[PDB]
Write a protein that binds this ligand. Structure first.
Ligand SMILES: Cc1cc2c(cc1C)N(C[C@H](O)[C@H](O)[C@H](O)COP(=O)(O)OP(=O)(O)OC[C@H]1O[C@@H](n3cnc4c(N)ncnc43)[C@H](O)[C@@H]1O)c1[nH]c(=O)[nH]c(=O)c1N2
Ligand SMILES: CCCCCCCCCCCCCC
Length: 452
């Protein structure tokens, strides 16, 4: 078959891959990005479509504008299971037309010299002399099977991890997802019969009964249009997510016009610390494929962008040292762990605690303001549940006279602090990965057993 040579091959053009392509562009490298979807569909994986302004500001990424921005967001209303307590957390964000925004990023990368092939699937890794060296591609548009050699593959295939999963199982880069370390999530976008009240606020409903291990949401995309959905924890033996959706839609969105459903669909959402390494010989993994999603709230588009930025920085470094080994690309890990990954680890711990609380516990915690709105935001945005905050909460939790997981909150805050420090001491070279990964697994297993 035809053979071509590129500096970098990016597989997948979602928020992650498009960010890597945009960040890598005009820097002296010959870059190809492929995606299985046609151009007009790239970026259309089911999603709530809500992204913090802070993630854009973190990277100085351009804001969505015009048709890309469906609705400006000014905060979130968090509802207790019993619906009796509502927290308002202020904070700026965007309700996107994700395909339009994603497609703009790709088009700008393309304008800056990135080559893009839509309707093109990476089918088989080229793995030779112990390195990823490219991919066999199938271009549906030309009916051509092609070999593309690359010094670095950026694996951005989303939740399918379709390319890295084909590599030798020996490689750290083939790390799999445990069923309990992901949610399945499902959403619909519908027009509403009435104008949406406070249409600039997202609504999140916590209820361990109607969305076990996740939550329900109501994300307005305009005055009369809403993205409504839920996520539930995987690996727990729960019934189909669409059963919960059908049963409880009316509770959360009594105002939707079912005759005006616009889109619907679901997908897997990783909810854990990132891949232990996001780099190996000839390859970096980003976005959902590298488990970059916030484990507490399930937001992954901002972290996908961050991972793409770190991949760009790492790759430029590798070309400046002629070194495409894991060691040569290792800055990917250092960059990502400092920007988001250490936070994700702390939040992976926090999520495990939250998923085991009862509705009674959550009703109590929210009613009693055991932590403040701002503290919960700090946990989300920084991965930090300060020990002083945990101490204050424990003083309130001390007044409860029934058994409750809430009594472990200080212990949870301590483990969150420990794992965060462990991640910020990420190994400086691959020869220390094993030792460190064992320390992390030990922290996690200890923590898991401390919750019973
Ligand atoms: C229902 C639901 C709701 C939400 C969310 C998820 C889900 C399922 N999330 C998560 C967020 O949607 C997700 O984390 C990011 O879109 C992931 O971006 P990626 O680029 O990693 O994957 P994404 O899946 O977007 O892109 C991967 C691309 O790779 C392509 N591909 C795969 N294999 C290939 C191959 N072998 N060859 C070529 N192409 C290949 C696919 O066609 C696809 O375009 C979220 N996050 C958030 O920030 N805000 C929110 O409101 C929500 N809500
Ligand atoms: C502002 C970003 C928040 C939107 C995230 C929506 C993600 C939906 C999936 C929820 C499942 C994760 C809960 C643990």
């Amino acid at each position: 078959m035809k053979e071509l040579k590129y500096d970098v091959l990016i597989i997948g053009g979602g928020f992650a891959g498009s960010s890597a392509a945009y960040q890598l562009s005009r820097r002296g490298l010959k870059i190809l990005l492929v995606d299985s979807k046609p151009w007009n569909r790239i970026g259309d994986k089911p999603c709530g479509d809500a992204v913090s302004k802070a993630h854009f500001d973190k990277l100085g990424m351009p804001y969505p504008k015009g048709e890309e921005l469906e609705n400006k967001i000014n905060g979130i209303k968090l509802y207790s299971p019993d619906m009796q307590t509502v927290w308002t957390v202020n904070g700026e964000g965007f309700e996107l037309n994700a395909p339009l925004y994603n497609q703009r990023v790709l088009k700008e990368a393309q304008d800056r010299g990135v080559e893009i092939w839509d309707l093109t699937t990476a089918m088989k890794p080229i793995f030779e002399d112990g390195y990823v060296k490219g991919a066999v591609l199938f271009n549906r548009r030309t009916n051509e099977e092609l070999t593309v050699y690359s010094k670095v593959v950026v694996e951005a295939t989303g939740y399918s991890r379709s390319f890295r999963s084909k590599l030798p199982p020996e490689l750290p880069i083939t790390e799999d997802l445990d069923d309990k370390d992901a949610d399945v999530a499902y959403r619909e976008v519908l027009l509403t019969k009435e104008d949406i009240e406070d249409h600039d606020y997202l609504r999140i409903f916590i209820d361990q009964e109607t969305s076990p291990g996740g939550y329900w949401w109501y994300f307005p995309k305009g005055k009369n249009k809403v993205n409504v959905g839920l996520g539930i924890q995987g690996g727990m033996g729960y019934p189909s997510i669409h059963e919960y959706y059908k049963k409880y839609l009316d509770k959360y969105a009594p105002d939707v016009d079912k005759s005006k459903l616009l889109v619907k669909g679901g997908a897997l959402v990783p909810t854990r610390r990132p891949l232990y390494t996001m780099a190996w010989n000839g390859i970096i993994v980003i976005g959902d494929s590298g488990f970059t999603v916030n484990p507490v709230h399930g937001g992954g588009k901002g972290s996908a962008m961050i991972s793409g930025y770190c991949a760009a920085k790492a790759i430029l470094s590798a070309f400046e040292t002629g070194d495409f080994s894991a060691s040569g690309l290792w800055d990917m890990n250092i960059c990502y762990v400092n920007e988001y990954g250490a936070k994700q680890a702390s939040l992976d711990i926090f999520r495990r605690f939250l998923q085991k609380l009862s509705n009674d516990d959550i009703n109590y915690g929210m009613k009693k303001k055991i932590i403040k709105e701002e503290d919960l935001l700090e946990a989300s945005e920084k991965g930090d549940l300060h020990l002083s905050v945990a101490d204050k909460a424990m003083r309130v939790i001390s007044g409860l006279g029934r058994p409750s997981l809430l009594f472990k909150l200080k212990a949870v805050a301590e483990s969150m602090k420990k794992i965060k420090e462990l991640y910020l001491n990420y190994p400086r070279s691959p020869s220390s990965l094993g030792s460190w990964r064992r320390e992390v697994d030990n922290v996690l297993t200890e923590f898991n057993k401390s919750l019973s």
